[PDB]
Design a protein around this ligand. Structure first.
Ligand SMILES: *CC(=O)Nc1cccc(CNC(=O)[C@H](Cc2ccc(OP(=O)(O)O)cc2)NC(=O)Cc2ccc(F)cc2)c1
Lengths: 85, 156, 104
C-alpha cells in the first residue's frame, strides 16, 4: 500500500505512488493493473498527470501548464475518459 | 428576455475553464496578478450590478480590470469604456475571451489564464485538440467523445 | 526543493520524487524498497553519466525547475548481473500514430 504497477498495452510497467494513482476513479474503483488498450506513450503521460494533479490541487502555488503533444492528444483523451481523470 | 437558458449554458462553460475565480474582489485579483507575465488574466464576478463579470489582466503598468455586460442574450465588453458599435457580441463568455486571446496572437492584451485549480486530464486534452483543429466531426473518436469536445470548443 | 523523477530500466519506469538535497544513495534506497535490490546492486545514471552515491541530486544536476511533476527528469538504472553490472538499457515508449491531416 505504497506503490502500484500500471502496465501498458505494449508491456511497459509504470510504478507509481498508490495515492497518486487514485487520481483515477477507474483505478480507484479497482497491486497491478494491465491496460490492454493504452500504449506506453499515453500511459507515461497519464502518470505525469497524476503527479501534477496531486501537486497542484489545493496549493497556493501558481498552476503551470501541463504539456500535451498534439500527436498523443486523441489517445490521451480516450485514456483520460476511460480512467475518469 | 435575459435568455436564462443561454446564460446557464454560458455559465456552465465558464465553470469548465478552471480560471473563473467567482466572488474575488478587485484587490484580491490585483494581488494575484501583481507579478504575473504581461497578459496573464482571470475572470471573476464584478462588484457592479450593471455587469456580470470582470476580466482582470496584468499589464506593463500593473493589473487592470475590464467589465463584461450580459444583455439580451449577448455578452459584450463594457461599452461605457469601449466604443459600443465596434464591440463584438457573443453568445458565450468563454467564446468572448477566446476571441480576444486569439486576436492578440495574430487595448486589451490577453495571453494566458491564471488557473484556480488543476483541470481534469480530459479537459487538458480537449484544450490541446481545440488548439489543433475545430473539425471535431471528422476526428477518429467515438461519438461520446466528440460530444464532450463540442461542450467546450475553446482554445483557452 | 522537490525534484520529480522517472527512474527507468528496461521496460520499468518508477515515478517518484525526492529533494535536491537527497543523495544518490537515498534514491537507491527508494529503488530498493520497490524493486528489492540493495543499493550496492544498483547503478544510477543521468544521461550516460554514472552518479556517485554520496552526491546530492542537485550536485548531479537534478533541479526543481528541470525535474517538475508535469515533466519529470529521467534517472537511468542498471542492476547487478553476476559479478558485474548490466549495461544501462532503457527501452523507448511506443511511437504515436500519424496525426490526422486536419490536426497537422
Ligand atoms: C475596450 C477596452 O479594451 N477597454 C479597457 C481595457 C482595459 C482597461 C480599461 C479601463 N479599466 C478601468 O478603468 C478599470 C475600471 C474597473 C475597476 C474595477 C473593476 O472591478 P469590479 O468593480 O469588481 O468590476 C472593474 C473595472 N480600472 C482599473 O482596473 C484600475 C484598478 C486596477 C487595480 C485595482 F486593484 C483597482 C483599480 C478599459
Amino acid at each position: 500500500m505504497m506503490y502500484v504497477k500500471l502496465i501498458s498495452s505494449d508491456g511497459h510497467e509504470f510504478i507509481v505512488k498508490r495515492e497518486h494513482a487514485l487520481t483515477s476513479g477507474t483505478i480507484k474503483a479497482m497491486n497491478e493493473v494491465n491496460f490492454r488498450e493504452i500504449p506506453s506513450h499515453v500511459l507515461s503521460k497519464v502518470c505525469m498527470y497524476f503527479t501534477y494533479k496531486v501537486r497542484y490541487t489545493n496549493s497556493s502555488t501558481e498552476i503551470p501548464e501541463f504539456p500535451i503533444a498534439p500527436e498523443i492528444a486523441l489517445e490521451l483523451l480516450m485514456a483520460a475518459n476511460f480512467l475518469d481523470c | 428576455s435575459m435568455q436564462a437558458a443561454r446564460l446557464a449554458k454560458a455559465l456552465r462553460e465558464l465553470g469548465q475553464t478552471g480560471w473563473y475565480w467567482g466572488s474575488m474582489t478587485v484587490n484580491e485579483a490585483k494581488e494575484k496578478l501583481k507579478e504575473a507575465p504581461e497578459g496573464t488574466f482571470l475572470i471573476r464576478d464584478s462588484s457592479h450590478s450593471d455587469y456580470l463579470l470582470t476580466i482582470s489582466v496584468k499589464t506593463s503598468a500593473g493589473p487592470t480590470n475590464l467589465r463584461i455586460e450580459y444583455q439580451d442574450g449577448k455578452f459584450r465588453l463594457d461599452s461605457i469604456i469601449c466604443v459600443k458599435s465596434k464591440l463584438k457580441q457573443f453568445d458565450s463568455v468563454v467564446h468572448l475571451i477566446d476571441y480576444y486571446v486569439q486576436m492578440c496572437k495574430d487595448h486589451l492584451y490577453l495571453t494566458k489564464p491564471l488557473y484556480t485549480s488543476a483541470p481534469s486530464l480530459q479537459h487538458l486534452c480537449r484544450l490541446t485538440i481545440n488548439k489543433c483543429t475545430g473539425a471535431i466531426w471528422g476526428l477518429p473518436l467515438p461519438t461520446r467523445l466528440k460530444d464532450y469536445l463540442e461542450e467546450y470548443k475553446f482554445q483557452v | 526543493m522537490d525534484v520529480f523523477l522517472m527512474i527507468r530500466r528496461h521496460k520499468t519506469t518508477i515515478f517518484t520524487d525526492a529533494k535536491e538535497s537527497s543523495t544518490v544513495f537515498e534514491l537507491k534506497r527508494i529503488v530498493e524498497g520497490i524493486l528489492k535490490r540493495p543499493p550496492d546492486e544498483q547503478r544510477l545514471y543521468k544521461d550516460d553519466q554514472l552518479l556517485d552515491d554520496g552526491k546530492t541530486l542537485g550536485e548531479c544536476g537534478f533541479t526543481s525547475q528541470t525535474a517538475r511533476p508535469q515533466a519529470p527528469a529521467t534517472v537511468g538504472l542498471a542492476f547487478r548481473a553476476d559479478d558485474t553490472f548490466e549495461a544501462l538499457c532503457i527501452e523507448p515508449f511506443s511511437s504515436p500514430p500519424e496525426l490526422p491531416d486536419v490536426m497537422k
